[PDB]
Design a protein around this ligand. Structure first.
Ligand SMILES: O=S(=O)(c1ccccc1)c1cc(Nc2cc(-c3ccccc3)[nH]n2)nc(N[C@H]2CC[C@H](O)CC2)c1
Length: 244
């Protein structure tokens, strides 16, 4: 299943012995697939350290930094099938509901963890999520350093927070169950501000159950203190998936 080429192996030294042979420390030169993001100053090598402490199975992992070369780059986990929006969209018509729920769950798990660490994503939306091995979805571009995904407090009084990420997650959910359709597709920025200000919400997608629709509208309360927190969303999304 996983046969290793001797040439990748380097015995360094013997550390003990069993009864069928002996044991060694060695190295193994792997060849990991990676995504390399080419490019402020050197204060960003501290930036890359807070990013690197943020490890979760549903957050795209930051492997390191490259600065010797010109093209100053970050090195990231490589994600098989690229961005979830494009994925939903090129694969339209082939998803089960359950699958669409499970993508939402993956995001929510990653986001609950950002919430707990007190990292505000700020630009969550499906174009910022990547699909990996077996349609696992990972949140990305939380590193750094628009209206369709903004809470009222974000276009109004620029107040960002996890509650404002919850609004983007409501929109993301709508994106997923509608299989990658663009929200407020024809509306302009002021029209969105006005409609959302008058209590209009995005319509329920066919593939989303009324229940799932309730959670979306719940992510879209007007006042953030009224929205649920990722930790709660997560328990509710996990429950629905485990039952049936
Ligand atoms: O499916 S892909 O077309 C593909 C390409 C070659 C072989 C097999 C598949 C593809 C995969 C990824 N994977 C990525 C991207 C990142 C990644 C990128 C930045 C930070 C961390 C990870 N990790 N893995 N990103 C793409 N474009 C990306 C271009 C930039 C944009 O942001 C998202 C789509 C496109």
């Amino acid at each position: 299943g996983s046969v290793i080429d001797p040439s990748e192996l380097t015995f360094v030294q013997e550390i003990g012995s069993g009864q069928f042979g002996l044991v060694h420390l060695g190295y193994w030169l792997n060849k990991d697939k990676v995504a390399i993001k080419t490019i402020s100053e050197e204060d960003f090598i501290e930036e890359a350290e807070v990013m690197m402490k943020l490890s979760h199975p549903k957050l795209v992992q930051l492997y390191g930094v490259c600065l010797e070369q010109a093209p100053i780059c970050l090195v990231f986990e490589f994600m098989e099938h690229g961005c979830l929006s494009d994925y939903l969209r090129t694969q339209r018509g082939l998803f089960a509901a359950e699958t669409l729920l499970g993508m939402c769950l993956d995001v929510c798990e990653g986001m609950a963890y950002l919430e707990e660490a007190c990292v505000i994503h700020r630009d969550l939306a499906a174009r910022n999520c990547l699909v990996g091995e077996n349609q696992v979805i990972k949140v990305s571009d939380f590193g750094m350093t628009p209206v369709k995904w903004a809470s009222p407090e974000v276009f109004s009084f620029s107040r960002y927070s996890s509650k404002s990420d919850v609004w983007s997650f409501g929109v993301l959910m709508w994106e997923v169950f509608s299989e990658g359709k663009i929200p407020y597709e024809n509306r302009s920025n002021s029209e969105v501000v006005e409609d959302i200000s008058t209590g209009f919400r995005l319509y329920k997608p066919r593939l989303a159950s009324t229940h799932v629709y309730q959670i979306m509208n719940h992510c879209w309360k007007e006042r953030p203190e009224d929205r649920p927190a990722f930790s709660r969303l997560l328990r509710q999304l996990a429950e629905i998936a485990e039952s049936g």
